[PDB]
Amino acid sequence: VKNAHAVVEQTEENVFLIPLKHLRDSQFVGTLLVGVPPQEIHPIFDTGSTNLWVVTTDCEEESCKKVKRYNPYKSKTFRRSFIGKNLHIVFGSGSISGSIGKETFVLGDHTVRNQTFGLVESESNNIFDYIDFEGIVGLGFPEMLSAGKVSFFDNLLSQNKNLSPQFSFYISPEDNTSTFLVGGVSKSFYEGSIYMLPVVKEYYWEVELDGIYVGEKKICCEEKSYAIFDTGTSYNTMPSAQMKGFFDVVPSAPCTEENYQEVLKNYPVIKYLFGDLVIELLPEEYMILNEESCIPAYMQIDVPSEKNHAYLLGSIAFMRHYYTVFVRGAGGQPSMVGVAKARAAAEAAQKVAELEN
Ligand SMILES: *[C@@H]1O[C@H](CO)[C@@H](O[C@@H]2O[C@H](CO)[C@@H](O[C@@H]3O[C@H](CO)[C@@H](O)[C@H](O)[C@@H]3O)[C@H](O)[C@H]2NC(C)=O)[C@H](O)[C@H]1NC(C)=O
Ligand SMILES: CC(C)[C@]1(C)CC(=O)N([C@H](c2ccccc2)c2cccc(C(=O)N[C@@H](C)c3ccccc3)c2)C(=N)N1
Numbered sequence: 068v069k070n071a072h073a074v075v076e077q078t079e080e081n082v083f084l085i086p087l088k089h090l091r092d093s094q095f096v097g098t099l100l101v102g103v104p105p106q107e108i109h110p111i112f113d114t115g116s117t118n119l120w121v122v123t124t125d126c127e128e129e130s131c132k133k134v135k136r137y138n139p140y141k142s143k144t145f146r147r148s149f150i151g152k153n154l155h156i157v158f159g160s161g162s163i164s165g166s167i168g169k170e171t172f173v174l175g176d177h178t179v180r181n182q183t184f185g186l187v188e189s190e191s192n193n194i195f196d197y198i199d200f201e202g203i204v205g206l207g208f209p210e211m212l213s214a215g216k217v218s219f220f221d222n223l224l225s226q227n228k229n230l231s232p233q234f235s236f237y238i239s240p241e242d243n244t245s246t247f248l249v250g251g252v253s254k255s256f257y258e259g260s261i262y263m264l265p266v267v268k269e270y271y272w273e274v275e276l277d278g279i280y281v282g283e284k285k286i287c288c289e290e291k292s293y294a295i296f297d298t299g300t301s302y303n304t305m306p307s308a309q310m311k312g313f314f315d316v317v318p319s320a321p322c323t324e325e326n327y328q329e330v331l332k333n334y335p336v337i338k339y340l341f342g343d344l345v346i347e348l349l350p351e352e353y354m355i356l357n358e359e360s361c362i363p364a365y366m367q368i369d370v371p372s373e374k375n376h377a378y379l380l381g382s383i384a385f386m387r388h389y390y391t392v393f394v395r396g397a398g399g400q401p402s403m404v405g406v407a408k409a410r411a412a413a414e415a416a417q418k419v420a421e422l423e424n
Contacts, residue, residue: 072263072394072403072422074254081229082251082419083175087112089240092198093301095382097247099204100173102142108135110202112236112247113299114272114393115379117205117212118156119172119184119219120163126188130195137202139186144171154185154214159368161194163187167214174204175249177230179223183215206234206298206393208269208402223249231421232395236298238386239411251421255414257390257407261422262344266402272296272393274404276378277342279309281316282335292376294339296391296404303353303384304368306375313365317354322361330354330361339380346389346406353384394422 085097088109096109101121108121122131124138139145147168156163165188171180187202205211209218217225224230230250237256239245246256264274276294279287286309305313322330334350353364364384370377380386392405405422 070424072261072405073424074252074261074420075423076418076420077231077251079417079419081231082253082421083177083230083249084253084416084419085112085175085247085249087245087247089243089245090199093383094198094200095238095240095245095298096201097204098175099202101137101170102139103144103171104142105173106137106142108137108201110204111200111299112204112206113297114206115295115297115299116156116203117207117209117218118154118203118214119182119205120156120165120187120203121170121184122201123165123186123188125165125186126190128190130190130198130200131187134199134201137186139168139170142170144180145169152214156185156213161190161192164189172219174223177223177227177249179219179226182219182222183217184219185214203299207271210270231423232397233393233422235390235392235405236382236386237390237409238382239409240383240387242413244413246416248419251419252390252392252405253416253419255412255416255418256410258410259408261390261392261405261407263394263403263405264341264344266396266404267293269396269402270372272402272404273377274341276339278338278340279305279378280338280340281313282337284316284335286313286316287378288376290376292378293373294341295370295377295379296393297379298382298386298391300379300381301383302364302366302381304366304379304381306377307367307369308375309378310365310367314363317363319360319362321359322356323359327354327356327361344406348384348388352388355383392422
């Protein structure tokens with residue numbers, strides 16, 4: 068059995084759109100209001116972590132002073148607890164450290180109170196030197212939380228009952244019209260039908276991956292593998308092993324204005340097999356031109372718990388071509404990721420809907 072969802076429509080204030088600016092350092096940043104009086108920070112919206120990070124004035128490092136740091140001692144709603152806790156996060160190309168606090172946030176005219184978040188205090192490992200980093204809005208599942216009782220998204224849903232437990236991304240950096248939608252989807256960002264993929268593990272937005280084909284060559288999968296939908300990354304990824312076998316069929320090379328145009332016509336078509344669904348990426352989709360060079364828009368990432376069996380899907384090499392919806396399950400019914408073709412057009416996204424049933 069498989070009961071379907073449906074695109075039932077909601078009123079305008081039940082799906083709100085957060086514009087995302089594609090910064091010249093590959094950051095997809097939006098606007099977020101912290102404290103009272105409001106202090107504006109521009110965080111990344113991430114479906115690969117649930118923690119709410121805010122760069123504060125308690126970080127006096129060189130990469131911290133260049134951005135709009137948040138000053139908790141100027142906020143009237145900030146209230147640290149008597150027995151303050153500390154926070155530690157280690158990722159691939161750096162690290163983030165700080166303390167925990169509770170604050171009241173406003174995300175696109177919606178207010179959220181008693182929101183536990185981490186105040187960034189240190190950033191030393193070297194990657195934050197290339198980025199004007201100001202915070203992270205966590206959109207992953209609550210099991211991925213390092214501290215706090217309720218996840219920001221869960222906490223926002225609890226205090227604004229008009230919002231349905233779902234959000235969606237439309238990536239289009241060229242036109243600068245990419246938008247983050249909370250509480251549903253907008254029919255003007257995609258065309259065709261929307262296909263759902265059940266979430267296997269409520270840690271990342273993770274679904275079973277049945278295979279990967281670059282043209283006709285099978286890169287994966289000989290052992291059960293999975294795909295993770297991460298809006299915090301620009302590149303698609305593969306584990307350490309399969310990454311080598313990939314760069315042998317699509318390698319980088321010098322390219323000119325008339326050399327890259329031909330690369331897009333002859334380069335293979337990558338196919339991602341999600342059970343019955345087959346999602347293809349064309350050469351003009353995953354190939355990028357940098358300093359007169361043709362780079363496969365892929366990088367190596369070994370997911371910790373999934374060894375060499377986890378493949379990530381990023382913003383520039385996937386979501387830019389496919390409108391993605393996130394539907395939070397509950398109890399028996401699972402959470403699911405919806406993929407459709409991106410309409411890649413302005414249209415007039417005044418009418419918005421949500422996935423029910
Ligand atoms: C977190 O925010 C909530 C609301 O967003 C704050 O509410 C606290 O919880 C309830 C709701 O007002 C209050 O507790 C009880 O209210 C009942 C009403 O029937 C009363 O009979 C009980 O004797 C008790 O007062 C509580 O007063 C309220 N505020 C405080 C300061 O306790 C909550 O305060 C926020 N954070 C924390 C840490 O409490
Ligand atoms: C960015 C951090 C908040 C974190 C916690 C770091 C992090 O592990 N991932 C995924 C991820 C998810 C699951 C398993 C492994 C990796 C990922 C993947 C690949 C590369 C990057 C990367 O270097 N991202 C650049 C763009 C960037 C952005 C903003 C700040 C720093 C760095 C990130 C996040 N989504 N977020």
